[PDB]
């Protein structure tokens, strides 16, 4: 109930069109986001992909895709890159003041979460996530995506991403560890302020 209502609040996208997952794809529904289907998710009846990018050009979440691209007798090395880069980004995201958050999500690699008290323009938080990642080295094998992709889609759906909690994809700790209870967590979960993101993006736009 209060974890529904948290998880519509954090994973907040297009307030008229969301998508459902099938085995070719993501299928656009276009009606807003009811309860039921965010109890469907949960259940693993329907998997969610929320499109993230609003009406006005503004997200309340962005992401970053850590993924390894495929499938061999020691493939231990490019899971433990993919820990490698994760890491590297959330040292630079930590010393922003920007609180993220890790999700497992499988074997593809890993998702880093960051959330907002209020929708902010796509554009900056994109501009400050595709620097933070010019900032880093990336390994062999590993691709880093970020969402949103799209900044100015005043005419398309946009892209979208799976949510976590789904059919497991669970949020992990600092030492990539699945973290029990993850409704408390859920709860846990702190937003950035929008005014301090503003903030750091004049002074990277600047500098």
Not at 174 to 187: A, G, K, R, T
Request: aromatic share 14%; with cysteine; net charge positive.
């Amino acid at each position: 109930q209060n974890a529904i209502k948290r998880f519509m609040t954090l994973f907040s996208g297009r307030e008229d069109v969301f998508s459902i997952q099938y085995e070719g794809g993501y299928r656009p529904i276009r009606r807003p986001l009811n309860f039921q289907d965010i109890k469907n998710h949960f259940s693993g009846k329907k998997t969610l992909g929320i499109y993230l990018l609003k009406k006005n050009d503004t997200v309340k979440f962005a992401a970053y895709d850590i993924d390894i691209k495929k499938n061999r007798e020691d493939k231990f090395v490019y899971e433990e890159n993919s820990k490698k880069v994760a890491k590297r980004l959330s040292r630079e995201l930590n010393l922003e003041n920007i609180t993220h958050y890790f999700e497992f999500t499988g074997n593809r690699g890993y998702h880093i979460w960051i959330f907002f008290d209020i929708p902010v323009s796509a554009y900056k938080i994109k501009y400050i996530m595709e620097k933070i990642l010019d900032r880093i080295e990336l390994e062999e094998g590993i691709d880093v995506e970020i969402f949103p992709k799209q900044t100015s889609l005043n005419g398309g759906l946009g892209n979208l991403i799976k949510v976590p909690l789904g059919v497991k994809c669970l949020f992990v700790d600092n030492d990539f560890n699945v973290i029990e209870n993850q409704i408390e967590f859920l709860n846990n979960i702190k937003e950035n302020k929008a005014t301090e993101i503003n903030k750091l993006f004049r002074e990277i736009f600047n500098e």
